[PDB]
Amino acid sequence: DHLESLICKVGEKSACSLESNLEGLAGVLEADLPNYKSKILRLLCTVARLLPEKLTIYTTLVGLLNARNYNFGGEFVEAMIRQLKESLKANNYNEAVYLVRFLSDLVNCHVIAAPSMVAMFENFVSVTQEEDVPQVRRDWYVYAFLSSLPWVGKELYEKKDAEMDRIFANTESYLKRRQKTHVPMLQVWTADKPHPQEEYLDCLWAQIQKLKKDRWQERHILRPYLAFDSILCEALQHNLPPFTPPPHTEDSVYPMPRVIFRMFDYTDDPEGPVMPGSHSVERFVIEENLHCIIKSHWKERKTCAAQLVSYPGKNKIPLNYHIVEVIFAELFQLPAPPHIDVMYTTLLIELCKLQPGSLPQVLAQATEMLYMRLDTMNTTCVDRFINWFSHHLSNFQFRWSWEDWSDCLSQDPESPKPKFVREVLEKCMRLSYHQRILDIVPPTFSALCPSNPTCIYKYGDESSNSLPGHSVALCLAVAFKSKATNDEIFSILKDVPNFNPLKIEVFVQTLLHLAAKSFSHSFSALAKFHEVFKTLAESDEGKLHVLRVMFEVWRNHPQMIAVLVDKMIRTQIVDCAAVANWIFSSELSRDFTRLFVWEILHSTIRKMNKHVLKIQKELEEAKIERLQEKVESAQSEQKNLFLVIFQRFIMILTEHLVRCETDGTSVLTPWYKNCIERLQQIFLQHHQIIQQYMVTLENLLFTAELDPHILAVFQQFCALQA
Amino acid sequence: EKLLKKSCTLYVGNLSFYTTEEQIYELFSKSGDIKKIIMGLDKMKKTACGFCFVEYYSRADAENAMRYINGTRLDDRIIRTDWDAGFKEGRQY
């Protein structure tokens, strides 16, 4: 337990220089080899795959230890190759990359001979030759290779230039024939300017090309081992045991393709160090290391902020811009961020407290840039941008220079910019009060503020007694007030003149209007007369009518609608399928593109997903026949929920396309962008579950005949694992 | 201490007197699904006294709230969250 502490904490804060701590730790680990050789090897293999941000610090350690005990270095190198094979077998491709990078950097420490790595990479690149295997398998082996080059590229080209050029030729020809079907579904922005959002392999390749052109010289990576040039030499090299990439199997799961998030360039920071270009390996290494730093500390926001800000480099870089860009790269990553969304919001706040005199200006500059680039930003990313920004604002007294965004005022309200502003003000209001938010904006922006969340009573002091069920509602009003019982209400509802659509309307209208004081009253009301609901909404048509009436009452209070829908699902008043159908109904037609709608849908899908996991976890433990059937029935409702949603999407999209062709108008309207990207979002947020429905989807819904505008979204989804 | 480690309930303090159950839903829902919220009232007037209880359906969601919601603002006041053994009738005053 003592060694683990010395190894894990090496390189942190101290009075002694790193070189001094490394040399010291080296002697400490050697002396303990006779009794803890097996432990030390385990810890070194662990830090190799868990702390990639400290790559060069540990590869230096291994080198100093190898210089004191050649045999130990041999067993370690052998143990590493073992770990790598294991990681690949357990589909831990992400961790495998770190091991490959560690072995690569060990070449610089002269612990591993260059030809061994050149050989390993030839094998990696040959995977691109395997037949009938996923492009994502071939992609990864190429990435493990190319992404290792910033560290060992120079050492390998000077030792095996001819062999290296062969590998590159083969690498290039593979990259030239890769399919890019997935790109449109993963880009944060589709616009080419000001920054192309490049497919990760094309970008990395360009970065390697530039590095090669620059004679394999790079100025960022910290190489501690250079300080021991007299102690680390070729005489201590080891040859690696042959390495065969584990063949493709049915249980093989490979990482999805990625698109490089890009928003800054050196002209955005004229007064700071020159920012490494988009096609330099320095930019790749910086972001890669910052991403790893967050991955290691995301749970501790304070420690995470401190580690990011103290990121060291060989030369000066505009670190604040790199940190902000990396945080937005994670938050806006598609399909999903690596960590829970809210963590990024609090991380930026912690960073602002740590660098009060510089970080806030950068974040402000970045916010302005994100707004200005809204026109082609993907809808899923826009929601996260809306949620982040509104939350951030509530932590700084809702202060913002809205006038800078005055260009949204004269555009079509459905357009990205004005819609963004309205959704943001809506979220702010949810964390504040109506008049308060109405007051944070300039007069010219008052029309974009949300309406007062007031209840709407159809049978109140305004309606005409000439309304169907008027007299009935009147009795229901007093009945509830006198704390009547379900039976009483059941009796009163019989006076309703016609599944009776009016019984539901008078009941829902009256009951909700009376508990319209708070979420609590409404919830308790749903509980008290829960029997009435389950009876009126017994049929699917009834569950849809309850939702329809609930909306007509609370349309000005989206948050109320969301919590009521969630309660009705949990207490089984309505089911997920009814909610899905309600989302695409004509009543909600004018609110279809609004955020709350999609928030309710996804929150509804999540409850179904968690319900499936719950039962699965139970049948798991009890392994009885009464569950194996319950699981397949729940998985049946789950699959059906997704089929209905896809069905409704195909239906409204086809209608839109036929309408446009009929009228000769363009298909690319603001409504369309929103609708097609919301479909895309279904596939993005639940791709793991949806992959189980492939066969069905291909035969019943997303068929070869389907209009290409729609089928493409399905083909892009397919490409994530093709 | 053995209890506080299985709980899905957080005690939230330093809330402004004008903070409502709806604002708390909006803020705390950012870490996960909220099962129930109980506002603290004055034993006499039945008026807010600056605290509430937030119960999540899962432990993981309450932990993320302790990690990212704790120490941030609501109605411009820095709020505090602490693990809680669980709500008991009467403790809402």
UniProtKB/Swiss-Prot annotation, chain A:
GO MF entry, a single one: molecular adaptor activity
Pfam families linked to this entry: MIF4G (PF02854), MIF4G_like (PF09088), MIF4G_like_2 (PF09090)
Protein family per UniProt: Belongs to the NCBP1 family.
Primary role: Component of the cap-binding complex (CBC), which binds cotranscriptionally to the 5'-cap of pre-mRNAs and is involved in various processes such as pre-mRNA splicing, translation regulation, nonsense-mediated mRNA decay, RNA-mediated gene silencing (RNAi) by microRNAs (miRNAs) and mRNA export. The CBC complex is involved in mRNA export from the nucleus via its interaction with ALYREF/THOC4/ALY, leading to the recruitment of the mRNA export machinery to the 5'-end of mRNA and to mRNA export in a 5' to 3' direction through the nuclear pore.
InterPro entries given in the database record: ARM-type_fold, CBP80, MIF4G-like_typ-1, MIF4G-like_typ-2, MIF4G-like_typ-3
UniProt keyword Metal-binding present: no
N6-acetyllysine carried by residues: K176, K630
GO cellular component, one term: mitochondrion
Protein name (Swiss-Prot/TrEMBL): Nuclear cap-binding protein subunit 1
Modified-residue entries (Phosphoserine), positions: S173
Occurrences of domain MIF4G (ranges): 1-212
Subunit structure: Component of the nuclear cap-binding complex (CBC), a heterodimer composed of NCBP1/CBP80 and NCBP2/CBP20 that interacts with m7GpppG-capped RNA. Found in a U snRNA export complex containing PHAX/RNUXA, NCBP1/CBP80, NCBP2/CBP20, RAN, XPO1 and m7G-capped RNA. Identified in a IGF2BP1-dependent mRNP granule complex containing untranslated mRNAs. Interacts with PHAX/RNUXA, SRRT/ARS2, EIF4G2, IGF2BP1, HNRNPF, HNRNPH1, KIAA0427/CTIF, PARN, DROSHA, UPF1 and ALYREF/THOC4.
Organism listed in the record: Homo sapiens
Coiled-coil ranges per UniProt: 603-645
GO biological-process terms attached to the record: 7-methylguanosine mRNA capping; alternative mRNA splicing, via spliceosome; cap-dependent translational initiation; defense response to virus; histone mRNA metabolic process; miRNA-mediated post-transcriptional gene silencing; mRNA 3'-end processing; mRNA export from nucleus
Swiss-Prot record, chain B:
Superkingdom to which the source organism belongs: Eukaryota
Result of changing N14A: Does not affect mRNA cap-binding
RRM domain segment(s): 8-86
Keyword annotations: Acetylation, Cytoplasm, Methylation, mRNA processing, mRNA splicing, mRNA transport, Nonsense-mediated mRNA decay, Nucleus, Phosphoprotein, RNA-binding, RNA-mediated gene silencing, Translation regulation, Transport
Binding site for mRNA: Y11, R80, T81, D82, W83, D84, R91, Q92, Y93
GO MF, one example: snRNA binding
UniProt record, GO biological process: alternative mRNA splicing, via spliceosome; cap-dependent translational initiation; histone mRNA metabolic process; miRNA-mediated post-transcriptional gene silencing; mRNA 3'-end processing; mRNA cis splicing, via spliceosome; mRNA export from nucleus; mRNA metabolic process
Cellular component annotations (GO), alphabetically ordered: ciliary basal body; cytoplasm; cytosol; nuclear cap binding complex; nucleoplasm; nucleus; RNA cap binding complex
Mutagenesis / variant outcome for changing F51A: Abolishes mRNA cap-binding
Keyword Lipid metabolism: no
Effect caused by changing R80 to A/T: Does not affect mRNA cap-binding
Cellular compartments annotated: Nucleus; Cytoplasm
Family: Belongs to the RRM NCBP2 family.
Function: Component of the cap-binding complex (CBC), which binds co-transcriptionally to the 5' cap of pre-mRNAs and is involved in various processes such as pre-mRNA splicing, translation regulation, nonsense-mediated mRNA decay, RNA-mediated gene silencing (RNAi) by microRNAs (miRNAs) and mRNA export. The CBC complex is involved in mRNA export from the nucleus via its interaction with ALYREF/THOC4/ALY, leading to the recruitment of the mRNA export machinery to the 5' end of mRNA and to mRNA export in a 5' to 3' direction through the nuclear pore.
The protein's assembly and partners: Component of the nuclear cap-binding complex (CBC), a heterodimer composed of NCBP1/CBP80 and NCBP2/CBP20 that interacts with m7GpppG-capped RNA. Found in a U snRNA export complex with PHAX/RNUXA, NCBP1/CBP80, NCBP2/CBP20, RAN, XPO1 and m7G-capped RNA. Interacts with PHAX/RNUXA, EIF4G1, HNRNPF, HNRNPH1 and ALYREF/THOC4/ALY. Interacts with SRRT/ARS2 and KPNA3.
Protein name: Nuclear cap-binding protein subunit 2
Source species: Homo sapiens (Human)
